[PDB]
């Protein structure tokens, strides 16, 4: 599977969760930004690696990073 890490430079704009096409990310409560929330990656076994969460990220260089790892049926996006 792929790793999806989130860093303290998160502002909690929820855009990466809205952009995710496989429900890998969640908005959990936090106390490090104004929105009082941070991104999380609970369902990483469904990550394909399309980098949409990074594309929808506003911080100067992303606060959410996707690292492509061991490939499986779910990560390769296979319907067969």
């Amino acid at each position: 599977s792929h790793s999806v890490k989130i860093y303290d430079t998160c502002i909690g704009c929820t855009q990466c969760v809205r952009a995710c096409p496989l429900d890998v990310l969640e908005m959990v409560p936090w106390d490090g930004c104004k929105a009082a929330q941070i991104a999380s990656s609970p369902r990483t076994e469904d990550c394909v690696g399309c980098k949409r969460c990074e594309t929808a990220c506003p911080t100067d260089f992303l606060s959410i990073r996707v690292y492509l790892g061991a490939e499986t049926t779910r990560s390769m996006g296979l319907a067969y």
């Binding site: 394909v48 399309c50 980098k51 490939e71 990560s75 390769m76 996006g77």
Partner: peptide, 19 residues
């Protein structure tokens, strides 16, 4: 969901093996 990506787009990331 390729239609939502549009007619002219490079890809949808290196995921799914590469698209």
């Amino acid at each position: 969901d390729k239609a939502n990506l549009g007619f002219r787009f490079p890809c949808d990331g290196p995921g799914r093996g590469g698209t």
